[PDB]
Amino acid sequence: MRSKRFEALAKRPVNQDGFVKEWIEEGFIAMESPNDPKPSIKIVNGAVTELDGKPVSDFDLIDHFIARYGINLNRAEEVMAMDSVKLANMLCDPNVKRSEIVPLTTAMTPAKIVEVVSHMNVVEMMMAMQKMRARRTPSQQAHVTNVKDNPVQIAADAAEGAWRGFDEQETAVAVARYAPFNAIALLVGSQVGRPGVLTQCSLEEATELKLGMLGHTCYAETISVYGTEPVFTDGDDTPWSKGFLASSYASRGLKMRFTSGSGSEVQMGYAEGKSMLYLEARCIYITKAAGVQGLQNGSVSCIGVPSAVPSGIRAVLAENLICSSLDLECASSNDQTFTHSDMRRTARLLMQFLPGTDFISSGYSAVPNYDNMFAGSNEDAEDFDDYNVIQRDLKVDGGLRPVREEDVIAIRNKAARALQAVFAGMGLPPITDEEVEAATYAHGSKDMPERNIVEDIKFAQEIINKNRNGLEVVKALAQGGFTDVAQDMLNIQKAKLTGDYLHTSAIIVGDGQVLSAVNDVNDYAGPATGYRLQGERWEEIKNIPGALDPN
Amino acid sequence: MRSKRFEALAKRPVNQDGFVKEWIEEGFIAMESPNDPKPSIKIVNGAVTELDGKPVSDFDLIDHFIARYGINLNRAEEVMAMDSVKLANMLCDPNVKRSEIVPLTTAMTPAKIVEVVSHMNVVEMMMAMQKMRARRTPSQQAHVTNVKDNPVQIAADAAEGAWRGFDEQETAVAVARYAPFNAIALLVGSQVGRPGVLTQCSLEEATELKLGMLGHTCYAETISVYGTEPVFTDGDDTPWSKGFLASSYASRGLKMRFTSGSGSEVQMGYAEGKSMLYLEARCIYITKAAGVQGLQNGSVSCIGVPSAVPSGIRAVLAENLICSSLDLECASSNDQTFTHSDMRRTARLLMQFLPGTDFISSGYSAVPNYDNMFAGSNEDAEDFDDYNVIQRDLKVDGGLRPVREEDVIAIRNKAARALQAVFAGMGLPPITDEEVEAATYAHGSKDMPERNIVEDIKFAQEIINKNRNGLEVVKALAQGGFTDVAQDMLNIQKAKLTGDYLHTSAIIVGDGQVLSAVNDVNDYAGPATGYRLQGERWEEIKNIPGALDP
Amino acid sequence: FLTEVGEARQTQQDEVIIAVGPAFGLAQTVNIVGIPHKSILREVIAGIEEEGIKARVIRCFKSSDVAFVAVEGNRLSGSGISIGIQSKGTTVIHQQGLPPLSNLELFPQAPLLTLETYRQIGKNAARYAKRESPQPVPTLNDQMARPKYQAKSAILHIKETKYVVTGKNPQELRVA
Amino acid sequence: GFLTEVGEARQGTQQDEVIIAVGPAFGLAQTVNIVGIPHKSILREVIAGIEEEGIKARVIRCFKSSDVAFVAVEGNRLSGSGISIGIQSKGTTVIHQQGLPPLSNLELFPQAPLLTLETYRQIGKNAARYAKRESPQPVPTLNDQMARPKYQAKSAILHIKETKYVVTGKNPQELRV
Amino acid sequence: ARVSDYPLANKHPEWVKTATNKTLDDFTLENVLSNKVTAQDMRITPETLRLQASIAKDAGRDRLAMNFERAAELTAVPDDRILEIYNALRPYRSTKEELLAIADDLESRYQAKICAAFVREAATLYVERKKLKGDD
Amino acid sequence: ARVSDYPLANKHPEWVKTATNKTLDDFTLENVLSNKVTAQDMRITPETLRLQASIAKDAGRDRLAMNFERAAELTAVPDDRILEIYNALRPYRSTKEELLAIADDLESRYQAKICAAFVREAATLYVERKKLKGDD
Numbered sequence A: 001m002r003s004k005r006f007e008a009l010a011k012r013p014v015n016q017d018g019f020v021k022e023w024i025e026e027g028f029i030a031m032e033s034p035n036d037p038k039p040s041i042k043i044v045n046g047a048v049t050e051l052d053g054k055p056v057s058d059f060d061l062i063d064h065f066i067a068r069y070g071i072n073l074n075r076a077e078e079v080m081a082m083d084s085v086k087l088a089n090m091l092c093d094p095n096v097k098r099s100e101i102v103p104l105t106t107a108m109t110p111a112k113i114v115e116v117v118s119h120m121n122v123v124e125m126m127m128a129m130q131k132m133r134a135r136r137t138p139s140q141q142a143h144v145t146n147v148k149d150n151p152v153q154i155a156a157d158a159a160e161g162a163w164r165g166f167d168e169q170e171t172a173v174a175v176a177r178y179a180p181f182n183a184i185a186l187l188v189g190s191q192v193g194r195p196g197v198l199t200q201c202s203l204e205e206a207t208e209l210k211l212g213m214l215g216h217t218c219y220a221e222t223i224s225v226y227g228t229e230p231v232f233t234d235g236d237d238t239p240w241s242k243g244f245l246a247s248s249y250a251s252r253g254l255k256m257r258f259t260s261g262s263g264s265e266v267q268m269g270y271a272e273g274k275s276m277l278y279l280e281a282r283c284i285y286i287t288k289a290a291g292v293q294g295l296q297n298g299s300v301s302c303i304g305v306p307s308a309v310p311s312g313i314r315a316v317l318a319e320n321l322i323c324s325s326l327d328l329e330c331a332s333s334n335d336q337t338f339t340h341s342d343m344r345r346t347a348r349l350l351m352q353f354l355p356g357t358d359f360i361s362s363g364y365s366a367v368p369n370y371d372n373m374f375a376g377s378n379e380d381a382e383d384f385d386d387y388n389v390i391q392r393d394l395k396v397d398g399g400l401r402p403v404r405e406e407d408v409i410a411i412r413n414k415a416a417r418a419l420q421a422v423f424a425g426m427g428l429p430p431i432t433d434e435e436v437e438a439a440t441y442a443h444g445s446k447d448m449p450e451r452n453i454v455e456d457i458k459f460a461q462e463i464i465n466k467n468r469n470g471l472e473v474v475k476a477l478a479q480g481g482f483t484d485v486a487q488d489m490l491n492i493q494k495a496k497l498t499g500d501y502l503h504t505s506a507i508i509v510g511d512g513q514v515l516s517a518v519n520d521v522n523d524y525a526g527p528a529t530g531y532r533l534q535g536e537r538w539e540e541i542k543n544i545p546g547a548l549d550p551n
Numbered sequence B: 001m002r003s004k005r006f007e008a009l010a011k012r013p014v015n016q017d018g019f020v021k022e023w024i025e026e027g028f029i030a031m032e033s034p035n036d037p038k039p040s041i042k043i044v045n046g047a048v049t050e051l052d053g054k055p056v057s058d059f060d061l062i063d064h065f066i067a068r069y070g071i072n073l074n075r076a077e078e079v080m081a082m083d084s085v086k087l088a089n090m091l092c093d094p095n096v097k098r099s100e101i102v103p104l105t106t107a108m109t110p111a112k113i114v115e116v117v118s119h120m121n122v123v124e125m126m127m128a129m130q131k132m133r134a135r136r137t138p139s140q141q142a143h144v145t146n147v148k149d150n151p152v153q154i155a156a157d158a159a160e161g162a163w164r165g166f167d168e169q170e171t172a173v174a175v176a177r178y179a180p181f182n183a184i185a186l187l188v189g190s191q192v193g194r195p196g197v198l199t200q201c202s203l204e205e206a207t208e209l210k211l212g213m214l215g216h217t218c219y220a221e222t223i224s225v226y227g228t229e230p231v232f233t234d235g236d237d238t239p240w241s242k243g244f245l246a247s248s249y250a251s252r253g254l255k256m257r258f259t260s261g262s263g264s265e266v267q268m269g270y271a272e273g274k275s276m277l278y279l280e281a282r283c284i285y286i287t288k289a290a291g292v293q294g295l296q297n298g299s300v301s302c303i304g305v306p307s308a309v310p311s312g313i314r315a316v317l318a319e320n321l322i323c324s325s326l327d328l329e330c331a332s333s334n335d336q337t338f339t340h341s342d343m344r345r346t347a348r349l350l351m352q353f354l355p356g357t358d359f360i361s362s363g364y365s366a367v368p369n370y371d372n373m374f375a376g377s378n379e380d381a382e383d384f385d386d387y388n389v390i391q392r393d394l395k396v397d398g399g400l401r402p403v404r405e406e407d408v409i410a411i412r413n414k415a416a417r418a419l420q421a422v423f424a425g426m427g428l429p430p431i432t433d434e435e436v437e438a439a440t441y442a443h444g445s446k447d448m449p450e451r452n453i454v455e456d457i458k459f460a461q462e463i464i465n466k467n468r469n470g471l472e473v474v475k476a477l478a479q480g481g482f483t484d485v486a487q488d489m490l491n492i493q494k495a496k497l498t499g500d501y502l503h504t505s506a507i508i509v510g511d512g513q514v515l516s517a518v519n520d521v522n523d524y525a526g527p528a529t530g531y532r533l534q535g536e537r538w539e540e541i542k543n544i545p546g547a548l549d550p
Numbered sequence C: 001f002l003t004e005v006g007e008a009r010q011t012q013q014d015e016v017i018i019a020v021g022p023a024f025g026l027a028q029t030v031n032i033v034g035i036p037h038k039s040i041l042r043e044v045i046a047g048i049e050e051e052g053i054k055a056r057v058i059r060c061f062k063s064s065d066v067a068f069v070a071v072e073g074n075r076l077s078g079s080g081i082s083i084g085i086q087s088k089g090t091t092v093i094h095q096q097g098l099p100p101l102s103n104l105e106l107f108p109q110a111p112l113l114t115l116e117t118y119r120q121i122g123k124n125a126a127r128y129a130k131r132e133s134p135q136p137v138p139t140l141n142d143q144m145a146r147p148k149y150q151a152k153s154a155i156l157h158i159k160e161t162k163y164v165v166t167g168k169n170p171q172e173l174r175v176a
Numbered sequence D: 001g002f003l004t005e006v007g008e009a010r011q012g013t014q015q016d017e018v019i020i021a022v023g024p025a026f027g028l029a030q031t032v033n034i035v036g037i038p039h040k041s042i043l044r045e046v047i048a049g050i051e052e053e054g055i056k057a058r059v060i061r062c063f064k065s066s067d068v069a070f071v072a073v074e075g076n077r078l079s080g081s082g083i084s085i086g087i088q089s090k091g092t093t094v095i096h097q098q099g100l101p102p103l104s105n106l107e108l109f110p111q112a113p114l115l116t117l118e119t120y121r122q123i124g125k126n127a128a129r130y131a132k133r134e135s136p137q138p139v140p141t142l143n144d145q146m147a148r149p150k151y152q153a154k155s156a157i158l159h160i161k162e163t164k165y166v167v168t169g170k171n172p173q174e175l176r177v
Numbered sequence E, F: 001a002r003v004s005d006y007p008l009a010n011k012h013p014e015w016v017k018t019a020t021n022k023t024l025d026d027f028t029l030e031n032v033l034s035n036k037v038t039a040q041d042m043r044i045t046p047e048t049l050r051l052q053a054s055i056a057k058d059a060g061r062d063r064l065a066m067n068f069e070r071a072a073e074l075t076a077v078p079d080d081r082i083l084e085i086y087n088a089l090r091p092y093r094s095t096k097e098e099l100l101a102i103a104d105d106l107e108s109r110y111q112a113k114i115c116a117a118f119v120r121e122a123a124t125l126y127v128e129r130k131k132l133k134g135d136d
Ligand code: B12
Pocket: B172, B173, B174, B175, B176, B202, B203, B204, B205, B222, B223, B224, B234, B235, B236, B264, B267, B268, B301, B302, B372, B373, B374, B375, C065, C066, C067, C088, C089, C090, C091, C092, C101, C102, C103, C106, C107, C108, C109, C110, C111, C141, C145, C146, C149, C150, C153, C157
């Protein structure tokens, strides 16, 4: 005889999630493992000889890169001698300036900073994160994709995402050969929705760089690094190849970050017996060592791995905190499905949403999750109204705003009309007036007419093989009745000339104003200081739909 | 033509919630209203002559009570002069001890402490709450009710709730004449599930005190106070009648707290143009002034009012923080429905769950919400697995644990049989073996056979009118096959003799051990100090159902 | 449809008083889900009268709280039994001698009341008047009633409250 | 045991073949993909799809990596048409082409739990038509936002064991079905 | 008593007696069944409440201690009369004279001086804030 | 340059020239439609990257500055050759001699001294850690 209470609980979505007991020998443990090395460092003649228990004669490529470029050796011995509990206390103490902490953490070893944050509970970590976040203003990044790679829908969804507040937007492709079309549609739509939104198209690394060189992207993020040598090898890179890639992006004036995240090494089969958090700390120091300004982390695509084991979502917040504490921009995930439960995914989001990070999510789905080509995000388009309500409930700036349906329809329509003009001016397969209308009123690709995919594929690849660059898109908009959009597209390209938006946490707001950690420095010093939601931004967030007036 | 994007959003549950634009004139604003008074105090010859801009000549009963009993007048002038920003900084600074803060906050006026916490975001308030919480160990409180006032189901659900970890449980009645049966069922089932769980039955005030005098409850919580004089009056009390009532419960050895909560004055029609948080601080100071050890607050039953307006859920956390900062036990709501949305109610709960309070919820529903006679709680029985998963995800002790189906079935069945013996021994309308089996495997009252409600309430009212007391229940258990339960019930009554559990935040754990803020002092001083989830308790929380073992 | 006819007076055991709040049938004419006040009175009266008991309707002014509206009703009721009804629809069956905030039966989620429930309320009231012990009206409970209607309930009550007149004795009403 | 190795794989002669390249654990450590579809069945449907389009189907096993991209690249190295199909033990599949970066592809099937034998058959049919220098309508994209929540932990565990069968330096072996 | 004496049940159970001078060890199932102890025997004493008041003061909780001192006085008032006095303090229940008589009776019959003063205070303020019988 | 000089677009736009020595103002819609500026003109310069490197150091970001100094050296390398060198650094692509000739090319032909040294460092470690052609 069964308890009907337990029958009711067995049907709950959360019991469809994947949980596992810790498996230490294969690194299936989130943090605080017995196999993790004890922090240590020895320095002779300005060169590291021992790093976290490992002598330099046993260094893998990751150890060499971190030991040579990733640690401030002038104070490493000093900071290693400090008490880890006291250091954790300094992290969440509102009266210890961010500028006083960065010289300490950047002199820590990977094991040392993991030891520091592992003394903290999630409230302490959030208290620290609101201080250690590099940019004073938090922001947000969206995915814009669909399962058909329909460029008309991408441009419309991108315009709506930019209109709702995303400052970076990311696309990806079901069919890799479509990518030039996805990149152009994303860029056009983003500039229509808000001039200055930065766009990326996530592909294999050599392919993505070439796409950037031609001018069809604004930045790149999915430049992956990994925490053990055999995993890094199967990702088709070394720390030196990825460091060279980072400098190649900058040499073309393109902003970029790395991507890592807890659980990748487990997911790819060689965790070398270490906890997810310790291996992720190696990834963060690889990023620091390469001179890359920022990092997308917080498990990202492998969220199913840490979320399966105890303290996994706390470990995800800890890896975000390590990132910001090392003075990197942190695009803090919240971009990938891990649970059937609305309660559970909300708890996971609030860890970054409440204190704020440089990008609270690094991929909120601006489309319904069925169209999300990263296999689903932790939030999607159907959550927009909940997200705004929680901003208003808690007085938290989560980067987004309530919007009017009439405005969104207009801006989606303009984005599709602008792309239609690009495709006509550049001689690409027609975008018909029926599709402009469909993209205007769509929720997702189920509302879109089918396109001739093989004709799109052929002309997308001609963009690459004939090196058709971003100036052709400017010209088409200008010859097609979109002088305003053409100018905004030109202004995005000009930002690649100044180097300004290469700096830590840089986005582009207002009338082409770069806003980075350099000129928007976080100055948190406790209550009533630091970023506060107020003024007209608060008026924007208050104005949710359905609020009845009693006057 | 209509956007299918906005068609999809219009269908979302959150868009069925009630929202309103701020209505200053009627107090429909959560905090930081331009009508709230500027903080101030003046003292002459040891008596307050002005409180927050108001002259003593114009004091209402609430001002008089707070001015005379609720503020440490030795330091109030000094504290009033301090920078409210620095005071807010001190609340969340991990290196400023709770014991350095309590002398300052208890010298503040209601407007002063509101100004302090209004400088804080919710992350800062949670950072402060984990320090100012009076009891070092967080706990949890459940509702145990059903729409039929079925006593067999109350005893079984209470036993399950105690087994899952609740340290206090509360019942209420669809038909008020049923209350003695609800109370006895709750007390019996709670002791079967874990001896020491404290129980209450929430009623009209004079009725509830009488039931407590008879020994059928262990404590009382819904002892309501209000933040304007006209609302207090419709509440059928004054600060002096509620203060006398508090001392009356203590004079019978019964633990009690008051209940307040933002938005009650708006709901009851006289907010006097003030923000919900300011009026709620008046309620917190009334509680302090009466010498009451703790307070249920965090909007509680009026949660639809602050949640309708901007920053209302932040204001709810702020009023919890004020309560703890004033060195009161805080039973921090999370006990009432306000939204159709799972995302939204989770954000509201995490404000208290993440730092911990004395009672993270003051009425998690241990029954499905269709049976919740407080009109639904912010969590219910179908959330138990999610709650345990989040504890494990975040390494946060939320007070509850995963439990085995076989253990719950056995403990529910024992509780039903124990109440069966009580009813038989007291000559109450019988509990049949069929009802015992139904309660054992029930999810809620839809699984229960119908009782003769008219006969039940006849005999329930005879318990009151013939003054049948708690020792009759002990006797029925001891003569009916349940001497173990009988001893546990007697041990509850014996705790009313010692006064130990009258103190701030007291619960009774383990082998009859009182655990209060006196002997479980919160000593938070930053990372790796204060309460930490670890050891066997962590092993218990990690063992959620369904974890594959490779 | 409601006309005052003078101060209500204490004639005996064969009557149930319906005590309505100050704005009932005046500035508010439907309850919180749009049920007309005239339809509600019709069904409550019919439930009382089908039981062989007289119904007598009074308007109360000293408080807009439905318990205190019912209490002045139960002081004047020849049977000691009364029904209190706010404009937004909240209803209680009260009895002389009980504390103001106790009762015999309470209907604390107005959005769930139907015209059928109102009729059953009048029936139960009259049976209490006859010193019978009716099976209580089956309990209505909806965990979403507060999410949907509590803010509107507060707004409607704030408005009902404006018609309170302290010290003003209750007025007997004739129904049209 | 339905796959036997006949020798080290050879650079393909003619221009009308597709190489199916399977990972080292495929068909021994596990005979079934992540959702119970028999391995023998997956070959048969992919093999059938290649041939019904008029093209030969070759099958090879790879050893140097358990990663389905590097497996496939070994196939497209030896395929006389330059087209290959990489298939992992837990079911992950990719259509690859000579000249492409190892982590690029023609078509990719990156959620193994969603693959059906019908989808496997269209893969071999599309792969052959690539070998014929046609541009087939790519297989319709399969995407389920709950695939990772349900199976990613199981995928990690399954892949962890796949990596035990990796042999540094060992060249690919030819396969008879 | 000090916080170091708390909990009395663990550190000094022999300090805890009942209204009729029974001890904690007197409350057993056998003594309940035989009526050797009864509900009247089983009530907290003013001595125990005054010990807890001392502990509250030592813990920094002066207002709580005040509450416990009021409670100590009230242990001597019967249940029926506690309820009469509580109701008499509710709004619109009493004339001023009726509340002053309660105060005198509290002091003279039960030596409950603190409670007497508290009721007199209410009586005074109920006049000004119009919470007496006939003010509704 | 110091952080007060940032952003260059706002504080010192005249410091920003292009590879072909065009100015920010030269990039107008009118000039784009008439091929008076082309994509070859629209590329960041080593001087601009070295200014940002100066600003990064002043912000306390020495590692970011070294990235920018590497990037400055790499502006001289055409797009096609950038991708060749990146690919040649990926695992198992290159012999040690091929890597060392890339480094000599970078140094001799492009004066990319830091990048050349970066590549030689990789070649040395790729031997010990077995990431060259034929080590798989
Ligand atoms: C919100 C609420 C309150 C609020 C608002 C009361 C008000 N007058 O505005 C607060 C917290 C202040 C409150 C106080 C009390 N409440 Co109340 N309350 C609720 C609750 C949780 C939800 C009702 C709701 O939101 N309905 C949805 C809205 C849209 O419908 P509505 O018709 O507008 O709701 C109104 C009525 O419920 C009314 N109301 C609320 N409580 C009470 C109690 C009584 C006796 C009366 C006549 C009316 C009443 O106020 C609501 C707003 O106007 C219910 C639980 C339940 N099962 O319904 C208890 C409940 C109705 N309350 C109850 C009680 C006992 C009380 C108190 C007497 C407790 C006390 N310590 O004194 C006081 C009475 C004060 C008063 N003057 O009404 C009991 C009634 C039991 C019974 N069978 O008689 C309930 C059922 C809970 C319980 N403990 O069992 N309550």
